[PDB]
């Protein structure tokens, strides 16, 4: 009978959480933001087309100098490009051709990759030998890696398909804390600007706000009908946007613990693969499976623009730290820079 | 352009040449994906043919790479899309499991669970034009067990002789009736541990798939 009592208590707690969230909903973003003029029509154009990949591109990350770019392809290749002159700076072969994530260290010294091999490979770029060699092979997950991000040069946050996330110390090579509480595979990560908290979306139609240092699930947001594939964080760290396969993007607030905005249209029936914000937070860019990307007004939920330069599924998006350009990568083996 | 920029351009050209050479080398490659219920002789078929395990071998003048994905006990629709360009799927089923059940089954059998996986794979979004090679493993024990209750538990609607041939034919027909794409074909084979000439069958099936795709491309069909 103890299990029944605990389940009833859990239901009562969920009802209390719902009641608490209801009282805070004294408005909505679309109503408060009705006093500001729209951004108008934004027509972005392709400035660079980065060729060289011979297969699908699965991940892409920008450097902190807004000039270097890293791309991962199922050919078994990571490529570090100069975004300005289209030159190829580095070509790192991989031990496993199945790569679904990549990351660029904030200091510009290290890169990361991972995939179905259940191993996160960290490569060092600044070496005395002149080549790029494997610095670490972090192992300990029981599933594929969906996203990996750097907190510093010795700490990395990974999310895997074994319904968990991990915080790895690179030098030791062992987990410092493990985040559990999801019931399904975790697909995306997004680090807060101050690197003290992060957000993790999973296939159980939920997202969770985790504290890095305490190793505990601070908050749990729901609302999506299907699995969440991509997640991103507002520049101030007080909001985050999630993309699912319901052809719907959702903007949540950390402080109010309530869903704020829903971006969806009747003419869109394809899922979202990558979500990114602008520097000022006014634009929200989301790549869809319909071979294109859409730019929404993040405060009024209007389709401000469409980028339609790809021939297959757009798998990765990125925005430079200075907000100068937006990089898109799709399964047609090409990277495009839009300004 | 300064001298350093010219040297950077030369380095980029060298990188591009290396990538093109690697792609040309990878062009001669036949990729296959191995799937099964997990106890249908997948390890046995791997031994005969010789996270994710890659098996390389070379038969006649072709280089086969088998992808065994059985440790990825997670949602299929989140990582199966990476195998969209696979040439073929080798699906392993156990005939001797027609009445064999597991403690976790809860009144279900090996059948109605392997057939469900076959139906999911055949009707998959990414595998509308990917042919499937089917191996009816453990034919000997299946034939020995059907002396009593020949396909009476798994298929109540079956009516025919208590012979291995007709029961295997009915099961194979049930497996082949799951294909709804005119461009997709299912190649069937009945194997056992004592029949090790199972690699020539895969070679011939791959050749037929390649010829069919080439003829579709040329429009001669």
């Amino acid at each position: 009978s103890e299990l029944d009592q605990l389940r009833q208590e859990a239901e009562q707690l969920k009802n209390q959480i719902r009641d608490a969230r209801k009282a805070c909903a004294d408005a909505t973003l679309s109503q408060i933001t009705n006093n500001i003029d729209p951004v108008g029509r934004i027509q972005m154009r392709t400035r660079r087309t980065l060729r060289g990949h011979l297969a699908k591109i699965y991940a892409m990350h920008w450097g902190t100098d807004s000039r270097l770019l890293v791309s991962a392809s199922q050919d078994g290749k990571l490529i570090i490009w100069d975004s300005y002159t289209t030159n190829k700076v580095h070509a790192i072969p991989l031990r496993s051709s199945w790569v679904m994530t990549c990351a660029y260290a904030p200091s510009g010294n290290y890169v990361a990759c991972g995939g179905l091999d259940n191993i996160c490979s960290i490569y060092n770029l600044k070496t005395r030998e002149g080549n790029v060699r494997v610095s670490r092979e972090l192992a300990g997950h029981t599933g594929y890696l969906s996203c990996c991000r750097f907190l510093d040069d010795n700490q990395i946050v990974t999310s895997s398909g074994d319904t968990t996330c991990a915080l790895w110390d690179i030098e030791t090579g062992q987990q410092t804390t493990t985040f559990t509480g999801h019931t399904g595979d975790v697909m995306s990560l997004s680090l807060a600007p101050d690197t003290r908290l992060f957000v993790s979306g999973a296939c159980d139609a939920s997202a969770k706000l985790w504290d890095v240092r305490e190793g505990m699930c601070r908050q749990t947001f729901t609302g999506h009908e299907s699995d969440i594939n991509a997640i991103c964080f507002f520049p101030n760290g007080n909001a985050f946007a999630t993309g699912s396969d319901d052809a719907t993007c959702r903007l949540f607030d950390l402080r109010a613990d309530q869903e704020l905005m829903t971006y969806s249209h009747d003419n869109i029936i394809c899922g979202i693969t990558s979500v990114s914000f602008s520097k000022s937070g006014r634009l929200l860019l989301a790549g869809y499976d319909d071979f294109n990307c859409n730019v929404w007004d993040a405060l009024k939920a209007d389709r401000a623009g469409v980028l339609a330069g790809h021939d297959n599924r757009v798998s990765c998006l990125g925005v430079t730290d200075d907000g100068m350009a937006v990089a898109t990568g799709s399964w047609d083996s090409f990277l495009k820079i839009w300004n | 352009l300064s001298a350093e920029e010219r040297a950077a351009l030369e380095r980029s050209k060298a990188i591009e040449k290396n990538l093109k050479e690697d792609g040309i080398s990878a062009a001669k490659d036949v990729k296959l994906l191995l799937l099964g219920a997990g106890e249908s002789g997948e390890s046995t078929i791997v031994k005969q043919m010789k996270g994710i395990v890659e098996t390389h071998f070379t038969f006649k003048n072709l280089h086969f790479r088998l992808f065994d994905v059985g440790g990825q006990r997670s949602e299929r629709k989140k990582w199966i899309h990476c195998f969209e360009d696979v040439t073929a799927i080798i699906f392993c089923v156990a005939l001797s499991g027609y009445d064999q059940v597991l403690h976790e089954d809860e009144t279900t059998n090996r059948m109605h669970e392997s057939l469900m996986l076959f139906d999911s794979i055949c009707n998959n979004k990414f595998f509308i034009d990917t042919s499937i090679i089917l191996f009816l493993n453990k034919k000997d024990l299946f034939g020995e067990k059907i002396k009593k209750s020949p396909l009476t538990i798994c298929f109540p609607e079956y009516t025919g002789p208590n012979t291995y041939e007709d029961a295997a034919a009915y099961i194979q027909a049930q497996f082949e009736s799951k294909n709804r794409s005119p461009n997709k074909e299912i190649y069937c084979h009945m194997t056992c541990a004592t029949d090790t000439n199972n690699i020539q069958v895969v070679f011939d099936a791959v050749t037929d798939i390649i010829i069919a795709n080439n003829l579709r491309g040329c429009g001669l069909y």
Partner: single-chain antibody, 229 residues
């Protein structure tokens, strides 16, 4: 991380020699190589440059058509074949490693070199500076034309050579600090006038500091400023 040169010595006029350099500890096939000459009364003088493969080969106007650079990636060995030497070609040769990409630090590692006996002008303001330990010093150099390219880079290099040592890179592109060099050294300037500032002078800073232009070949070195206690 190691370059060993060999093949130098005394050669009679009109003869031929072959200097060689063996590389160990780095991916020699991915690095461009330079031969740089130093005479007792001339300072540093660039001899030749060979690219990462067998492409761009550059020679100085005083040696073009007389020397030949060859490369052997499998054995990681570089060769300089010299014919018809004169009293002018008496100097010490240094093999300089140099990798070129965005963010690279060219001229980072210098071999020991071997001693053999038989359009942009860079000017050093002073040949020596009286210095004392624990004080800050400034060394000034001038160029005949602006080294600030349109892309914002200023291709000026500051190297250090202590008595009995091969030069090591101090500053590349007039502002950056090479690996292994403490934050004591700094650099600034604009246009054609540049200044290297040493905030705190130690015993290891005594020696000759050289300026190099790398905007377009040939690369010209200055006379060199000698800081001595």
């Amino acid at each position: 991380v190691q370059l060993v040169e060999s093949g130098g010595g005394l050669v009679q006029p009109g003869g031929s020699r072959k200097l060689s350099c063996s590389a160990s500890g780095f991916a020699f096939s991915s690095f461009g190589m330079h031969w740089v000459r130093q005479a007792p009364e001339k300072g540093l003088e660039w001899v030749a440059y060979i690219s990462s493969g067998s492409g761009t080969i550059y020679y100085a106007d005083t040696v073009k058509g007389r020397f030949t650079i060859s490369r052997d990636d499998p054995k990681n060995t570089l060769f300089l074949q010299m014919t018809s030497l004169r009293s002018e070609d008496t100097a010490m040769y240094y093999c300089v490693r140099s990798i070129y990409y965005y963010g690279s630090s060219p001229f980072d590692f210098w071999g020991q070199g071997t001693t053999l006996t038989v359009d942009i002008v860079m000017t050093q303001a002073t040949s020596s500076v009286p210095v004392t330990p624990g004080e800050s010093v400034s060394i000034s150099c001038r160029s005949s034309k602006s080294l600030l390219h349109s892309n914002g880079n200023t291709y000026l290099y500051w190297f250090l050579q202590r008595p009995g040592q091969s030069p090591q890179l101090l500053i590349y592109r007039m502002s950056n600090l090479a690996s292994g060099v403490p934050d004591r050294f700094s650099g600034s300037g604009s246009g054609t006038a540049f200044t290297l500032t040493i905030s705190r002078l130690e015993a290891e800073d005594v020696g000759v500091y050289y300026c190099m232009q790398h905007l377009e070949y040939p690369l010209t070195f200055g006379a060199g400023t000698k800081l001595e206690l």
